[PDB]
Amino acid sequence: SYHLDTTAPPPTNLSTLPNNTLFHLWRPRAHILPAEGQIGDPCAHYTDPSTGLFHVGFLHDGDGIAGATTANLATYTDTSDNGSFLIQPGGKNDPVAVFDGAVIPVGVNNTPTLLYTSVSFLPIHWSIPYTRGSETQSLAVARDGGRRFDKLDQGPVIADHPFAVDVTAFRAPFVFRSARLDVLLSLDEEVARNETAVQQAVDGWTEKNAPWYVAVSGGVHGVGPAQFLYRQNGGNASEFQYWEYLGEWWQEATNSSWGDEGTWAGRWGFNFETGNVLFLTEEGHDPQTGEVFVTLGTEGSGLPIVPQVSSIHDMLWAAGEVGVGSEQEGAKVEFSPSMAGFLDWGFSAYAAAGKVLPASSAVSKTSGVEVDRYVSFVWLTGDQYEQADGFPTAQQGWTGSLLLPRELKVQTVENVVDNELVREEGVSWVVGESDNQTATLRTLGITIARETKAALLANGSVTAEEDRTLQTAAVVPFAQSPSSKFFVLTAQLEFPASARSSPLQSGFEILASELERTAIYYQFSNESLVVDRSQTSAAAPTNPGLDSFTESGKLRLFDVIENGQEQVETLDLTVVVDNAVVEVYANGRFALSTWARSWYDNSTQIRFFHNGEGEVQFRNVSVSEGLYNAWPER
Numbered sequence: 001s002y003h004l005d006t007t008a009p010p011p012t013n014l015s016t017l018p019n020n021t022l023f024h025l026w027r028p029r030a031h032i033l034p035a036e037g038q039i040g041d042p043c044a045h046y047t048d049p050s051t052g053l054f055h056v057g058f059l060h061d062g063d064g065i066a067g068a069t070t071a072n073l074a075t076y077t078d079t080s081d082n083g084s085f086l087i088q089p090g091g092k093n094d095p096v097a098v099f100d101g102a103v104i105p106v107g108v109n110n111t112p113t114l115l116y117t118s119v120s121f122l123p124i125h126w127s128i129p130y131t132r133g134s135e136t137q138s139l140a141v142a143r144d145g146g147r148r149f150d151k152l153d154q155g156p157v158i159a160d161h162p163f164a165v166d167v168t169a170f171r172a173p174f175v176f177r178s179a180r181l182d183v184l185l186s187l188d189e190e191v192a193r194n195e196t197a198v199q200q201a202v203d204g205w206t207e208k209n210a211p212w213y214v215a216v217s218g219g220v221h222g223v224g225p226a227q228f229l230y231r232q233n234g235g236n237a238s239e240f241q242y243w244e245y246l247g248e249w250w251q252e253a254t255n256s257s258w259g260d261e262g263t264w265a266g267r268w269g270f271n272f273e274t275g276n277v278l279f280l281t282e283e284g285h286d287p288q289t290g291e292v293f294v295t296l297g298t299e300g301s302g303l304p305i306v307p308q309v310s311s312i313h314d315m316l317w318a319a320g321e322v323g324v325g326s327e328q329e330g331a332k333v334e335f336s337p338s339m340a341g342f343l344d345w346g347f348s349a350y351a352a353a354g355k356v357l358p359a360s361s362a363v364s365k366t367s368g369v370e371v372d373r374y375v376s377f378v379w380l381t382g383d384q385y386e387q388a389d390g391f392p393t394a395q396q397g398w399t400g401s402l403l404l405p406r407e408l409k410v411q412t413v414e415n416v417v418d419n420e421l422v423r424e425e426g427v428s429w430v431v432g433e434s435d436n437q438t439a440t441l442r443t444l445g446i447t448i449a450r451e452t453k454a455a456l457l458a459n460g461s462v463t464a465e466e467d468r469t470l471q472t473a474a475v476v477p478f479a480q481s482p483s484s485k486f487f488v489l490t491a492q493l494e495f496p497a498s499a500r501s502s503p504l505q506s507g508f509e510i511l512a513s514e515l516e517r518t519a520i521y522y523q524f525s526n527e528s529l530v531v532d533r534s535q536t537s538a539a540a541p542t543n544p545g546l547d548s549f550t551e552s553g554k555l556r557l558f559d560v561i562e563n564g565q566e567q568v569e570t571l572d573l574t575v576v577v578d579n580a581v582v583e584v585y586a587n588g589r590f591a592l593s594t595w596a597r598s599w600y601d602n603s604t605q606i607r608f609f610h611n612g613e614g615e616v617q618f619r620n621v622s623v624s625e626g627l628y629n630a631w632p633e634r
């Protein structure tokens, strides 16, 4: 007879416990996840034109797309009960499975319309032969306020992958509109070569009757990963049956990668997944003036290759330009990356699905936002993409969660010293404006959606810590630590120029007891925020299912001019700890999320950490405890 006692040592084998015994142990309170069961890819988000409510979707129990709605982008309500499903397999187009999809707010019958990957055969993986007809794209229309999606009574509207192309995958259609694409396709192939003519047409563009484009993710056996582009036939905004194939607007060589050493954006891998096409500005999303950005997941593998196994799941982002379709007979249009990085450096972060969130939305109206935004929902698989070594899934009763909604826009880093640090090849940023003395840098901006950040701190207990410096190695416990695993830790770390060349490691130790701790620090050596989980869980040693490997992401701190002097850019940290779900944010342009499954209720001390190498200044350190409930109606 074993009842859970989180103040006592964990049993040696967690998988021997009764189903659901671990249900609340690591479960978050402020994140998006079903009431129970497993959550897969986030997909099918859209602002309902009628109600202005923002709809969120996600695969659930490998049995279809489930959903929820929100009015504030802080609290959520399930569309229904018993799974809250919107659409499931079993149709003629989708006898085996229902994969990711995207929604056109005003589609068929002028109602929200879902274009999704209908599945008829399994297995499907880039490492094995593709079964013809495995993945097709079908339509379904929203009924009863989006609480369900009825499949149109006909076959798929894109019933096959490109003719005779040996695709490694063909799925996760994502819809978007683009002024630049309509122009490039509307103009002559000779007159669409000079930006002078283009830009002019781009200004007359009208978002309302523009045709929808569709990017499908996958690759080509023996050649490369790629995104397949389609658009309503003939650019007719009212054509929903036929979609003309524009070609592989973006493809890369098998297991190639941004930069020579693949340092800043992992690798393009063997297959591209759940692509998203964004158009940014310094303030939000604008399909007319925004720069072209694409977020995607890439499947990697070492050698030899393990059939049906993707050893690496990188959550990347790329930005660049779109031009005519070269001179050859390839794609009508091509996307050329200028920069690329990670949307989230977490091993278990993947399949992000975002959506434009209009200023006209009930969400932006209520919060006072008056610009169009692009909110992105990143997936945090719960069992390492189903490769976990015996995770106690039956015991937990649920699997996975989505990360906090995030705003994506163009973030600028001003007053930067245009130095080798800036002029490196294959990085996650481009020089905006430089006088060879100081330049502005452009990169993907990553922040917690404002309404969610506010809700996280609204009723939280706040406890500051005095600024302090550490030269010699030390681990200093905060004056006061929270008494629960639900909090937001904020701090700024100032480093002296002499630290770049040192083995310095500075940060914090969270979720700490004498038998447990989780280290989060910055390493100048490879320049990377690190989350050491080797001591995170007292239960991990005998339960390999609880992964404890190190997580880390590259974050460069540039030399800049602050008060009128040069200094190493301040490390601005924001760590949200949702019981076991941990998200590390840095400089409004870095994210590293992972699972920190601490066990003891006592495991809640926070400590300052410095390894004695170099010197670090902690400024403005504080903690907000409590966070909030994202599912009030449950």
Ligand SMILES: OC[C@H]1O[C@H](OC[C@H]2O[C@H](O[C@]3(CO)O[C@H](CO)[C@@H](O)[C@@H]3O)[C@H](O)[C@@H](O)[C@@H]2O)[C@H](O)[C@@H](O)[C@H]1O
Residues within 6 Å of the ligand: 040, 041, 059, 062, 099, 100, 122, 123, 124, 125, 126, 171, 172, 273, 274, 297, 299, 308, 310, 350, 351
């Ligand atoms: O190959 C065996 C495998 O086939 C099916 O999964 C295929 C596909 O799943 C994952 O792809 C994503 C990324 O998270 O998840 C959804 C599906 O749930 C896809 O639309 C999306 O690309 C993997 O990352 C891919 O490597 C994999 O090829 C099936 O669902 C699995 O249970 C298993 O049978």
